[PDB]
Design a binder for this molecule. Structure first.
Ligand SMILES: NC(=O)c1ccc[n+]([C@@H]2O[C@H](COP(=O)([O-])OP(=O)(O)OC[C@H]3O[C@@H](n4cnc5c(N)ncnc54)[C@H](O)[C@@H]3O)[C@@H](O)[C@H]2O)c1
Ligand SMILES: NC(=O)c1ccc[n+]([C@@H]2O[C@H](COP(=O)([O-])OP(=O)(O)OC[C@H]3O[C@@H](n4cnc5c(N)ncnc54)[C@H](O)[C@@H]3O)[C@@H](O)[C@H]2O)c1
Lengths: 373, 375
């Protein structure tokens, strides 16, 4: 089979500065280029890498016009808008170094250059994220942040921070989405003797997995939220989840409940989360995802607190780019590139989001006209 | 029929809840709420004096302990029952810990005081709370949460800066020093995380059945275990053989870049040695909730010590065992222990007893001859 020749690859990755020189395990950076440069160049392909992706006349905007393959990463996402896709005359393959391709306008991608392939490294960092969810649940429930601040400030007042400290044992935790991440969140929660583990997804777990993990499907989202002490969002960003967690839906959660979001920032309405915290309807919010990214320096969820001055466990978008995760998604990007560059187009079907002008996944909403290859 | 004891003076040393304990009645373990004991004691004709004033020369604790028959302490704000104080406690018969860990009592001195006083604690009351806090703290350290949250609140954004020290717990080896009620519950919570191995070191082992259920392996030598672990968690009591156990020499057997968690007692580590190991990068992190002494002095080195990247500190005040869920259980348990004494039945749960009738009543405070387990 004839290999494709002299393919222009454009990678939009985060700037690792001195960190990426000092810690070579930062593969997903403009410095280390996912370990791809020599492997591409030895085949006669070219690689252009940038972190400059947001401003008018950005390097991304110039280079995308003749890139055949565009590698993006959700931690520093080159937004492939309809406007940009219309200028990307050579684009055939959009590879996400990570999981979650919602920074691509997938409807526009299906109408671009005959229908481009949008692929991501399915399963590469799902464990990383599930760990981060459980961590964030415990940090919020146990009131870690203001307690650690009290220590670093030289203070000592056990009652001040114990007054909002709970145990996770005996609490009800619900996941929105029970795919690779949500299932792994419930598998890590099992050992904590929560009162119940609940999920909401139009793609259910098998009865065998329900019994093994010890969890229950709730058919209505609002009915699940009303039963939970903790809610974790683990679904992709698509038209029906954008702004899903607005004031009306957050009002269905219990007063004093804890919300975790390691999915996508735009699934919540940031002002509505900030207001719920401000009034004490939420005890806490945490996670690692923001809209847009980089998160603006004045984004309200950097500093929003509950009425006790706690309840914020936000971090930069990092869970999916742990050093352990990066080794796996760097390897997976190479595998997806090799499928295309070899001329075999022998993608893992689970890596495909859109392909040949159609959605190739069930996970971006309940659709007609999905073609699983 | 057994005659109840009469007009017993009870002294409780608890933390000051200030306005918090008025606003949140679930803060039972405070001078405000008195573990919900006051009416229950007073209706029997007993007296209760409660204080947070326990450290200064001529403290309320020092005055009242001289004729208290029962002294209730709490590890979060511990009235240290030193040999000097026990020698002045002329009426003391029962020392009850509101919580778990009675090392703030000189237990050797307690065995020689007033014919051997009973030292009891509420075994099992907050062991889940602590085990949760351990797993949380392990994850916070391994995933580099603290400096990442600080970056966000400061208005900054640099993924590489904090991802460069962010690992997954999957595939790491975790060891526990102690596999009693907390250590076993830590391993039960780690099971779902697909650690490479779960290890323990304890002279009281798990049953083979429990080892296979949880999926863990006993290591016979402590230094051997430390050299294999990426994460170590300390879950044993404070006694002569564990005081200063985690000194520079033992910490040097841990892997470079390892994470150390201590929710047991502060004095099990040598704080200057932990700070030095962190500062040179031998530890990537230290965290937990316990300090020596308590309250932790404002300048305690572990409030502010960091790894060379400016992270690696997940310290909190002594709080894990005093979650609102825990306080309900240890308040109820203190009442149960008090009722055993005040009823004249002395029908304590054997597992609640630390020393009793002049002898250690537990195997958990070191390997001893002259341990008398009741039953
Ligand atoms: N924070 C990070 O670093 C990080 C990294 C990986 C993935 N993610 C995000 O997490 C998402 C999920 O990852 P995954 O590996 O679990 O995906 P997955 O496709 O295995 O599972 C997602 C599940 O969400 C369900 N879903 C879709 N819409 C839903 C809705 N309205 N309500 C409930 N469930 C719904 C789907 O049916 C599916 O089962 C990704 O799409 C990405 O946005 C974040
Ligand atoms: N941070 C908190 O709020 C909090 C709350 C409760 C308990 N604690 C501390 O945790 C300790 C453990 O509580 P637990 O409920 O698990 O007690 P436990 O008695 O069930 O178990 C303690 C175990 O440690 C073992 N041990 C003793 N010396 C050891 C040594 N040198 N090496 C290894 N193992 C050793 C014992 O054999 C025993 O199995 C308490 O004594 C207390 O000091 C902390």
């Amino acid at each position: 089979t004839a290999r494709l020749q002299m393919v222009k690859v454009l990678a939009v990755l985060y700037d690792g500065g001195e960190h990426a020189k000092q810690v070579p395990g930062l593969l997903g950076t403009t410095e280390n280029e996912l370990g791809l440069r020599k492997w591409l160049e030895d085949q006669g392909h070219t690689l252009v890498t940038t972190s400059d992706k947001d401003r008018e006349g950005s390097t991304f905007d110039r280079e995308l016009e003749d890139a055949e393959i565009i590698i993006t990463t959700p931690f520093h996402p080159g937004y492939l808008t309809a406007e940009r896709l219309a200028r990307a005359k050579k684009l055939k393959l959009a590879v996400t170094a990570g999981i979650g391709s919602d920074h691509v306008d997938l409807d526009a991608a299906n109408k671009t250059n005959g229908g481009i392939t949008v692929a991501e490294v399915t399963g590469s960092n799902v464990v990383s994220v599930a760990e981060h969810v459980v961590m964030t649940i415990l940090v919020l429930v146990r009131n870690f942040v203001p307690a650690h601040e009290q220590i670093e400030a030289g203070r000592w007042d056990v009652a001040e921070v114990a007054k909002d400290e709970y145990d996770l044992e005996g609490k009800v935790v619900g996941t929105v989405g029970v795919g690779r991440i949500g299932e792994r969140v419930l598998r890590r929660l099992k050992g904590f003797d929560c009162k119940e583990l609940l999920y909401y997804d139009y793609q259910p777990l098998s009865p065998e997995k329900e019994k093994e993990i010890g969890c229950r499907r709730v058919e209505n989202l609002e009915e699940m939220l009303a039963q939970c002490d903790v809610v974790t969002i683990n679904c992709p960003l698509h038209e029906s989840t954008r702004g899903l967690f607005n004031k009306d839906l957050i009002s269905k959660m219990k007063r004093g409940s804890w919300l975790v979001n390691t999915a996508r920032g735009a699934i919540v309405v940031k002002e509505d989360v900030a207001e719920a915290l401000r009034t004490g309807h939420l005890r806490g919010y945490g996670g690692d995802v923001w809209f847009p990214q980089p998160a603006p320096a004045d984004h309200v969820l950097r500093t929003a607190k509950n009425p006790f001055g706690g309840g914020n466990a936000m971090v930069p978008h990092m869970s999916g780019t742990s050093l352990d995760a990066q080794k796996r998604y760097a390897e997976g990007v190479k595998r997806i590139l090799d499928s295309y560059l070899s001329g075999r187009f022998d993608y893992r079907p689970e890596d495909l989001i859109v392909h040949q002008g159609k959605y190739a996944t069930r996970a971006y909403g309940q659709r007609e006209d999905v073609k699983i290859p």
